[PDB]
Amino acid sequence: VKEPTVSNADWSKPYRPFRIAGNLYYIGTYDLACYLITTKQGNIIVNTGLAASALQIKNNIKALGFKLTDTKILLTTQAHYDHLGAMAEIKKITGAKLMADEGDATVMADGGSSDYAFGGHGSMFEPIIADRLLHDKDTIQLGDTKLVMLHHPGHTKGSCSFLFDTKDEQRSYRILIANMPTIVIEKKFSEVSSYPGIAKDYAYTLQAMKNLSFDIWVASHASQFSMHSKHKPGDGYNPKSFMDRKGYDESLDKLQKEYEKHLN
Ligand SMILES: [Co+2]
Ligand SMILES: [Zn+2]
Ligand SMILES: [Zn+2]
């Protein structure tokens, strides 16, 4: 396994973990977004960072006063090394069930060596095998929390978002953990031959994502939802700073124009 060169220091830069809304917490790096969802029956972790991120993740969970041994479920939005780098390790240590969008099961099982965009040069992250293959609109229940997986292909063949309700003592929130449909290739869709449905998948995702409704959206990278504009370490609890429909729409507009060009 050889993790590709990382030029962006913020991918490994530690960041102080915080509560976003209800039982949703941010436990990722300065730019690689990882989430903890805490329930009465244990916890869900969504994403890791790079290979070395396992230490920070364990520490972040601890720092919020939760227990790593309460981890029951592992999810990802995206089978790329920047979001699955430490997943094999976290799964080993926790013994949690990994649930994955069927579209990415294969790439995950080979550590990214069959990746349509970065394949052919061996494993880019430690292979993981999912205990559950999820399809569009499958639900994941733990205690009183229920997640809906949304198949949002294109970024990866199985990239996906999660839609779920949480509550604090005053209010309930509909949260989208979105995988934004960014384009990873530099060439035209028509030339990406080992992913024949790539253009149709982007078209489907862009349309499906525009029509979603929620109170709060977050993304796979902190920068993609401007997390550092909405929250500083020490802010305390403030779900409302993550209410940002305009931000979401502006982002999908940009990604729509990108889709039209075919690349970046
Ligand atoms: Co299936
Ligand atoms: Zn990616
Ligand atoms: Zn990424």
Author numbering: 28 to 45, 47 to 57, 66 to 76, 78 to 87, 89 to 161, 164 to 192, 194 to 252, 254 to 306
Cite, word for word, the article reporting this structure.
In this study, we report the phenotypic, kinetic and structural analysis of a metallo-β-lactamase isolated by metagenomics from an uncultured bacterium from Alaskan soils. Results show that LRA-12 exhibits a broad spectrum profile, since penicillins, cephalosporins, cephamycins and even carbapenems were hydrolyzed, with kcat/Km values ranging from 0.16 to 1.75 μM-1.s-1. In this sense, both LRA-12 and GOB enzymes present the highest carbapenemase activity among class B3 MBLs.
Metagenomic LRA-12 crystallized in space group P 1 21 1, and crystals diffracted at a final resolution of 2.1 Å. Interestingly, a cobalt ion was modeled between the two monomers of LRA-12 in the asymmetric unit, bound to Glu140-Oε and His175-Nε2 in a tetrahedral coordination. The metal-binding site 1 is defined by Gln116, His118, and His196 (site QHH), which is uniquely found in this enzyme and in GOB β-lactamases; zinc-binding site 2 is constituted by Asp120, His121, and His263 (site DHH). Both Zn(II) ions adopt a distorted squared pyramidal molecular geometry, in which three water molecules, along with the aforementioned conserved residues, participate in the metal-coordination. In LRA-12, a water molecule occupies the position of Ser221 lateral chain in FEZ-1/BJP-1, forcing the side chain of Met221 to point outwards from the active site, which enables a displacement of the β11-α5 loop (containing Met221) that carries it, thus increasing the size of the cavity; compared to FEZ-1, BJP-1, and L1, the Cα of residue at 221 is displaced 2.70, 2.72 and 3.06 Å, respectively.
